[PDB]
Design a binder for this molecule. Structure first.
Ligand code: PC1
Ligand code: PC1
Ligand code: PC1
Ligand code: PC1
Ligand code: PC1
Ligand code: PC1
Ligand code: 3PE
Ligand code: 3PE
Ligand code: 3PE
Ligand code: 3PE
Ligand code: PLC
Ligand code: SF4
Ligand code: SF4
Ligand code: SF4
Lengths: 70, 176, 316, 156, 101, 378, 97
């Protein structure tokens, strides 16, 4: 019957699902549980590089807040 | 009597002209075609599960040739060569001689299954129902020689399929 | 971790292409009142694997090519570019977040024409070269409308960033304000990928350029061709059927986005089973005399519409 | 694991791949092509066994000689057999291809396509039913299943 | 760097598949087998090139709408598209978009 | 001009001035088998199967043409029930041909799906063939003097059930083709044939009626019981491939109309001429009567003698006028048997119909002529 | 409603074949998991089923034996293994098994 086509579509659906899921999960793993920072314009990159210097460790995704101010 | 297939005049009123303009720009008749293929997607396919299911046949089916016997085991063929004379492809070669007990029997009965056209004229011309076309249609070989049948092969086919050949003849001899 | 991401994209793309062949043979089968592959594995699930193994252990013809350097370059270019058009796709997060991602996909798609033209030379047959030329004319002609249609849609988006199309469609699908462009974008994707009713290469009794290839190299062109069908239909969903993106549940986007791309991919099989084939001059007159006049007019209407409605999108 | 065991398994894998993906090129010459088209029709649907409906001569794995082969046509049949990548099998469908058939004694007929090309399976009938042809194809799969190329290579 | 890795990976994989596609079957040892310019096609390619050059001038339209000179910008945007339409109209009426000899 | 020896059972030697076609030279004989010469060595009964294999999509129509020719020379008349079966299976066979003609024509130009739908209907008409004769295609059922066997009990019910649902099958074919613009672009104004040229070039069948010529041998020179059934003859107005396509679709509809009447008006009685010097006796009486056994023996060894004479007998076969010029010398074996295939004259006109069209149109023109090379080559 | 009864028919196919193991056996041998009415078994082990709610052609089928004449036919089933007595019934040449 027609529903015997679903097994092929489900496999194709799972295959098309891994690239989206994998990329989203790797970004959060590589960026401390946050989304990867987007720098399309120089201003965004300037802030991101500044975060690298302000974080201590040379990581832009390690954010420092009020506890870092005297 | 006759009828015209393509002799219509398209109405040129504004509504009809706009109906054709919508058909041209909105692809109405093309989507109507997608509807028909969509419906077939949800019908039950007509495919059967061969070899576990087989296509329907009838008692008259003209399959593999075979030689039959009487209920006593005596061969029906008495070497009359009517099948040989009628065979349009000249696929039958027969030789005969008086048997040891004096009966009229064949010492050769070959059907070249690669000259045969499976016409059935042999089973029609036989006066003793000796040569028949049985119901088997699955006997493809791996070599050309295996399709040159002799008397031993044809008799074996009769002994093999006599259970089904007799029932087919019983169900059709009244139409003959 | 980035290298793992690349392979997490490349392998599923090929696997999806492997099982799009099974889906196409079964969706075509049921639309034709039959089943399609259901013997090789449960419901034909192992059919793509059998075909793949069989092709790669069959002797390749490899005739006396004119060059033998364009004979290897062509399949490499075809499959290299097909995989390269996925790296900017947001699903919802791109592998590579390009600012001009939309323009990058147009550029790579235009380079794919060289695969047809290089394999036509390597064929060494004059007739095989004529078929390649007709395929190039069809491909370049129908990417004129892709560029202008894409430009018209971006005037409602505001940039060439692919991930901005997600924001642009956060209240409504772009299929609504731009369904006329959607109709002409969908058909241009069919013509770009040489899909029916625009498949003259496979349109026996008239013409394929990739005919001297067989077994393995043939499978490389086939994988590239079927990888672009998925990619084009993924692009269509992003461009006209945007999916809402919740940053805390990114898998919801992927599930919804995946379903839309499958339905559009199956529409390609739906169309192939329903219509006859265009003549070569008829699909040229479809582009030059029907699509192009409308695409130019709609482009003017879409440059001016945001201005007169005070609805110009943000530059960033 | 012994070498005779690895080679035995590799034979099954390649044998399974080849018999599960038999793409035929059909020489539809005469009436037997109509029965060949009925094997592709919904009733039997050759495509569900992995047998694609129509395949180009440079992608095909088996040639089905379906119809009378005349002298005028014999050179072009050999020309297509020689251009078919290996492994390549040939199936003779019907009496005309088998041994000449109704036209065995004609001045213009090749008395069997097996004097022009090697043949692997003979399907008898005039025409063989769509089911009798499907039996031949399934019989070719079993023939391919018995091949022992790798095992024979390992014993050279 | 990420982009360079992606490009290198895609084409490296494409190359490896091609080489092992021309030689994997050669693991098997099969028996040795032995043994007009058309002016209309050229016109299509040239027309595409010229139409493709006028697209190049239209691509920056999304950025052009951000100016404070919308009256000037909209006037020239419609000028380029209209002349692109006049180019099509000329070939159309001169039998340039035809395939019958 | 570029020359293309396309080659293979059709070889076209064409010279092209770009996209256009300037000269088309069909090369035939790739399926020439000497059918006409072999028949001279066969008795009149042995030669009958040769006519199933000429136009192998319209088997029983070919058998009927040869049966009428021999009966005319024999000066006998098949019984009325045999003539209703021959008309009944004459029109079932027209459906088999037109399904093949319309759907392979559509298959060649890209439309692949209607082929499968209508071949499930062909697979059910092949069961009617196999139930009356035991063969799906080559029945050898229609013979001089009538038919071979009476219809099996329960057959006409199944034909009624089949004919009841078939009009919907055609309607689905037309939902895919008739109004489809892509299909109208491939056929409208393609292969236009003027009425005067069609007559001079020896055309027949839909090739004439598609150009407005009102001619159909079933109505002008009726045979069997075709003057006792009401049906209409489709007539085109433009002479293009689209008009011929519509004609073939409408004939499939008028065939269901004739079939509906053959079932209702099927009479009783014997099914082969009650003249044992032409038709073989019943088997039961062959095994009890001396005269019946002698005639069975002679009819199957020597055959019947046909009085001397020559006739040209033609019928409205699905592909056009199919006829035989049959010469009898007075013996049991025909002296000469020329077969007039409708597709032989149609193909000879491919060079004219294709003048001024593109290469892809030659595929559409060949489909519209409905060419099967079994009858062209013979 | 009918939606829920469809999923129940699928489940009872597993029970109608004798558990999961039997269900998978007929899925990998016969590529079909319908449940029919056992009409009989021949001397070689072939089992013949029927179901008259299926359309003509699919209302009679044979599940071939796993061993015939000393040959292992678990995977290598052949259409010629049906004996003549069951050949006539399985091909709808008669109504009587
Ligand atoms: C799977 C889930 C089930 C639903 C799947 C979607 C089904 C879509 C195909 C259904 C076809 C039904 C047949 C039908 O109604 O067509 C006849 C109808 C009418 O066809 P018609 O041509 O015969 O109508 C006659 C009236 N005039 C003359 C005015 C045309 O088709 C339509 O009305 C559709 C027109 C709208 C199409 C606009 C497409 C724009 C693109 C938008 C993209 C989204
Ligand atoms: C290698 C095999 C052949 C590859 C052919 C395909 C080349 C890919 C396209 C070129 C790269 C590109 O356009 O990126 C745009 C994209 C456009 O992205 P963008 O404009 O959004 O900017 C990205 C960064 N922000 C947004 C922050 C400003 O470029 C990049 O994303 C990063 C730029 C890296 C530049 C390094 C490129 C070196 C390689 C280029 C030469 C390739 C050799 C070709 C050999 C001959 C074959 C053509
Ligand atoms: C006519 C022939 C060609 C037709 C091609 C038709 C195939 C393309 C798909 C058309 C149907 C739209 C996809 C429906 C399935 C998507 C499921 C989904 O995303 O979640 C439901 C989605 C949920 O919404 P969403 O996640 O897609 O995002 C909606 C975006 N906003 C909020 C801005 C509107 O809703 C539907 O799709 C209901 C329909
Ligand atoms: C208030 C201001 C509003 C301004 C905007 C106003 C817009 C008003 C509407 C304008 C008309 C709409 C234009 C639509 C495009 C028309 C293209 C055209 O020219 O058609 C004629 C063309 C050809 O027309 P023709 O061949 O019949 O004739 C042309 C003209 N003559 C007669 C002179 C030759 O039709 C086609 O394009 C054929 C399509 C090929 C087959 C494709 C199958 C389609 C299957 C359905 C797919 C559905 C799309 C799904 C999209 C999903 C995407 C997510
Ligand atoms: C991705 C492409 C590259 C993949 C590289 C290879 C790795 C994938 C291997 C996949 C194996 C698929 C084999 C499945 C066979 C099957 O389903 O049963 C068919 C058949 C089923 O029976 P059948 O096919 O003979 O009969 C069919 C007819 N009916 C339906 C009636 C039954 O089972 C067999 O007996 C075939 C034996 C195959 C043995 C293969 C062993 C391989 C072991 C691994 C070797 C090393 C790998 C390197
Ligand atoms: C991409 C996804 C697909 C990946 C490919 C998966 C393929 C899995 C199987 C690979 C190993 C088997 C391939 C080689 C089999 C070729 C063959 O059948 O012939 C054997 C050949 C036959 O050699 P031969 O000596 O018997 O005969 C050659 C000369 N003739 C034919 C003229 C007599 O032997 C080999 O070369 C095998 C090498 C060892 C393989 C391990
Ligand atoms: C089958 C009948 C229909 C026919 C098939 C239809 C096409 C196939 C279906 C579309 C493709 C979808 C394929 C994927 C579905 C299965 C996976 C899934 O449901 O989502 C799992 C997802 C993973 O969770 P994760 O990312 O690891 O979050 C961890 C946070 N702690 O968890 C989630 O967050 C999901 C919310
Ligand atoms: C709108 C509905 C009202 C309307 O159109 O008028 C109906 C009226 C009656 O129809 P009728 O009698 O045929 O008149 C035409 C005879 N010349 O018909 C009329 O007389 C109306 C005037 C006839 C001329 C109308 C021309 C309409 C087509 C021009 C192109 C319009 C394009 C609009 C954009 C298309 C894209 C959506
Ligand atoms: C409501 C009222 C709405 C306004 C009224 C509608 C506008 C009036 C003009 C509409 C008619 C257009 C002209 C025309 O119809 O000519 C048709 C002719 C077709 O010729 P052809 O197809 O080659 O012949 C084949 C025969 N077998 O065509 C030709 O011969 C040449 C056609 C060339 C057309 C140029 C196409 C490019 C222009 C695209 C439009 C972009 C906007 C142009 C700028 C507008 C500025 C405001
Ligand atoms: C705005 C322009 C509006 C006018 C549109 C012109 C294009 C119309 C399509 C061309 C077909 C046509 O309508 O006739 C053009 C005519 C052809 O000659 P004709 O005698 O009519 O017949 C053919 C003879 N071989 O004669 C021609 O071919 C002349 C038209 C082709 C040249 C186009 C020139 C358009 C005028 C410029 C408009 C844009 C402003 C440019 C400013 C540049 C200043 C630096
Ligand atoms: C590199 C290309 C592949 C080389 C394979 C090879 O040479 O593999 C050899 C080994 C066994 O070793 P051997 O007995 O020396 O076989 C040498 C080859 N003969 C026997 C033909 C001389 O094959 C196996 O065990 C299984 C291989 C799968
Ligand atoms: S079926 Fe016909 S051709 Fe075949 S052996 Fe019998 S009589 Fe001869
Ligand atoms: S098989 Fe029958 S017809 Fe032939 S020789 Fe024997 S008895 Fe005579
Ligand atoms: S074997 Fe029979 S069906 Fe096949 S081509 Fe010859 S005569 Fe025709």
């Amino acid at each position: 019957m027609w529903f015997e086509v679903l097994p092929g579509i489900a496999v194709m659906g799972v295959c098309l699902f891994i690239p989206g899921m994998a990329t989203a999960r790797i970004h959060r793993f590589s960026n401390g549980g946050k989304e990867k920072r987007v720098a399309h314009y120089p201003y965004q990159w300037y802030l991101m590089e500044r975060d690298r210097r302000v974080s201590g460790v040379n990581r832009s995704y390690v954010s420092k807040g009020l506890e870092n101010i005297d | 009597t006759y009828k015209y297939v393509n002799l219509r005049e398209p109405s040129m009123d504004m509504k009809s002209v706009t109906d054709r303009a919508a058909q041209t720009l909105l692809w109405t008749e093309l989507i109507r075609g997608l509807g028909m293929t969509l419906s077939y997607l949800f019908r039950e396919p007509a495919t059967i599960n061969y070899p576990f299911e087989k296509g329907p046949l009838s008692p008259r089916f003209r399959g593999e040739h075979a030689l039959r016997r009487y209920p006593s085991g005596e061969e029906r063929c008495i070497a009359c060569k009517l099948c040989e004379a009628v065979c349009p492809a000249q696929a039958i070669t027969i030789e005969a001689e008086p048997r040891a007990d004096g009966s009229r029997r064949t010492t050769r009965y070959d059907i070249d299954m690669t000259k045969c056209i499976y016409c059935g004229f042999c089973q029609e011309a036989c006066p003793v129902d000796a040569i028949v076309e049985g119901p088997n249609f699955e006997f493809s070989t791996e070599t050309h020689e295996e399709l040159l049948y002799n008397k031993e092969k044809l008799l074996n086919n009769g002994d093999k399929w006599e259970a089904e050949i007799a029932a087919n003849i019983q169900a059709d001899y009244l139409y003959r | 971790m980035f290298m793992i991401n690349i392979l997490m994209l490349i392998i599923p793309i090929l696997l999806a292409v492997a099982f799009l062949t099974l889906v196409e043979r079964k969706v075509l089968g049921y639309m034709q009142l039959r089943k399609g592959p259901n013997v090789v594995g449960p419901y034909g699930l192992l059919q793509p694997i059998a075909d793949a193994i069989k092709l790669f252990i069959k002797e390749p013809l490899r005739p006396a090519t004119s060059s033998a350097s364009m004979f290897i370059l062509a399949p490499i270019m075809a499959l290299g570019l097909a995989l390269t058009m996925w790296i900017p796709l947001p699903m919802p997060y791109p592998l590579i977040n390009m600012n001009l991602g939309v323009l990058f996909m147009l550029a790579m798609s235009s380079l794919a024409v060289y695969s047809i033209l290089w394999s036509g030379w390597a064929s060494n047959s004059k007739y095989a070269l004529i078929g390649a030329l007709r395929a190039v004319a069809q491909t370049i002609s129908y990417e004129v409308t892709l560029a202008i249609i894409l430009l018209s849609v971006l005037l409602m988006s505001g940039s060439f960033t692919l991930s901005t199309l997600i924001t642009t469609q956060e209240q409504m699908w772009l299929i609504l304000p731009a369904w006329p462009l959607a109709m002409m974008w969908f058909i241009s994707t069919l013509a770009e990928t040489n899909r029916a009713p625009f498949d003259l290469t496979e349109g026996e009794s008239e013409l394929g350029f990739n005919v001297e290839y067989a077994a393995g190299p043939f499978a490389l062109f086939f994988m590239a061709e079927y990888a672009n069908i998925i990619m084009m239909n993924i692009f269509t969903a992003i461009l006209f059927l945007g999916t809402s993106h919740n940053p805390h549940m990114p898998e919801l986007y992927t599930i919804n986005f995946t379903i839309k791309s499958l339905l559009l991919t199956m529409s390609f099989l739906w169309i192939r089973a329903s219509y006859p084939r265009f003549r070569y001059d008829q699909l040229m007159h479809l582009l030059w005399k029907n699509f192009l006049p409308l695409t130019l007019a709609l482009c003017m209407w879409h440059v001016s519409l945001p201005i007169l409605t005070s609805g110009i999108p943000p530059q960033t | 694991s012994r070498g005779e065991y690895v080679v035995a398994k590799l034979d099954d894998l390649i044998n399974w791949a080849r018999r599960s993906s038999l793409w035929p090129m059909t020489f539809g010459l005469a009436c037997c092509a109509v029965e060949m088209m009925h094997m592709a029709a919904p009733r039997y649907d050759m495509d569900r066994f992995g047998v694609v409906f129509r395949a180009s001569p440079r992608q095909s794995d088996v040639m089905i000689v379906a119809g009378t082969l005349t002298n005028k046509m014999a050179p072009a049949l050999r020309k297509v057999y020689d251009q078919m990548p290996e492994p390549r099998y040939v199936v003779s469908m019907g009496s005309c291809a088998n041994g000449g058939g109704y036209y065995h004694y004609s001045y213009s007929v090749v008395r069997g396509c097996d004097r022009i090309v090697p043949v692997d399976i003979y399907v008898p009938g005039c025409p063989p039913t769509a089911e009798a042809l499907l039996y031949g194809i399934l019989q070719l799969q079993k023939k391919i299943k018995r091949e022992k190329r790798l095992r024979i290579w390992y014993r050279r | 760097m990420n982009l360079m890795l992606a490009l290198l990976t895609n084409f490296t994989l494409a190359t490896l598949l091609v080489i092992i596609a021309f030689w994997l079957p050669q693991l098997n040892v099969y028996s040795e087998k032995t043994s007009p310019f058309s002016m209309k096609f050229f016109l299509v390619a040239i027309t595409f090139l010229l139409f493709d050059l006028e697209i190049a001038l239209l691509l920056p339209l999304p950025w052009a709408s951000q100016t404070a000179n919308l009256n000037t910008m909209l006037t020239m945007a419609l000028f380029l598209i209209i002349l692109l339409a006049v180019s099509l109209a000329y070939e159309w009426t001169q039998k340039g978009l035809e395939w019958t000899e | 001009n570029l020359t293309l020896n396309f080659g293979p059972v059709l070889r076209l030697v064409m010279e092209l001035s770009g996209e256009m076609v300037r000269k088309c030279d069909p090369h035939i004989g790739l399926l020439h088998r000497g059918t006409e010469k072999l028949i001279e060595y066969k008795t009149y009964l042995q030669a009958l199967p040769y006519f199933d294999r000429l136009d192998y999509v319209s088997m029983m129509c070919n058998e009927q043409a040869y049966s009428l020719a021999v009966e005319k020379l024999l000066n006998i008349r098949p019984p009325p029930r045999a003539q209703w079966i021959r008309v009944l299976f004459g029109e079932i066979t027209r459906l088999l041909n037109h399904i093949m003609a319309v759907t392979t024509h559509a298959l060649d130009i890209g439309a692949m799906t209607p082929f499968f739908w209508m071949f499930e209907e062909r697979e059910k008409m092949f069961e009617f063939y196999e139930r009356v004769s035991g063969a799906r295609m080559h029945a050898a059922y229609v013979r001089p003097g009538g038919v071979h066997q009476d219809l099996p009990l329960g057959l006409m019910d199944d034909i009624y059930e089949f004919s009841k649902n078939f009009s919907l099958r055609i309607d689905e074919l037309e939902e895919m083709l008739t109004n489809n613009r892509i299909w109208r672009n491939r056929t409208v104004d393609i292969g236009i044939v003027t009425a005067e040229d069609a007559l001079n070039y020896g055309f027949s069948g839909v090739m004439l009626r598609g150009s407005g010529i009102q001619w159909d041998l079933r109505k002008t020179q009726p045979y069997d019981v075709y003057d006792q059934v009401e049906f209409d003859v489709p007539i085109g107005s433009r002479g293009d491939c689209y008009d011929r396509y519509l004609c073939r679709v409408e004939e499939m509809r008028q065939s269901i109309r004739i079939i509906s009447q053959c079932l209702n008006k099927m009479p009783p009685g014997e099914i082969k001429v009650d003249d044992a010097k032409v038709s073989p006796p019943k088997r039961a009486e062959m095994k009890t009567s001396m005269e019946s056994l002698i005639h069975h023996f002679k009819l199957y060894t020597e055959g019947y003698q046909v009085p001397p004479g020559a006739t040209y007998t033609a019928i409205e076969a699905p592909k056009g006028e199919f006829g035989v010029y049959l010469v009898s010398d007075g013996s049991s074996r025909p002296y000469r048997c020329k077969i007039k295939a409708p597709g032989f004259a149609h193909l000879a006109g491919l060079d004219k119909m294709s003048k001024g069209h593109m290469l892809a149109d030659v595929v559409a023109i060949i489909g519209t002529q409905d060419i099967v090379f079994g009858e062209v080559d013979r | 409603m009918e939606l829920l009864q469809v999923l129940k028919r699928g489940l009872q196919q597993v029970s109608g074949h004798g558990g999961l193991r039997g269900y998978l056996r007929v899925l990998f041998r016969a590529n079909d998991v319908r449940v029919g009415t056992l009409v009989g078994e021949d001397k070689y082990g072939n089992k013949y089923y029927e179901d008259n709610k299926q359309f003509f052609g699919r209302h009679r089928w044979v599940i071939y034996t796993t061993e015939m004449n000393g040959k292992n036919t678990f995977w290598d089933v052949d259409g010629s293994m049906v004996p003549p007595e069951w050949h006539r019934w399985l091909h709808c040449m008669t109504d009587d098994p």
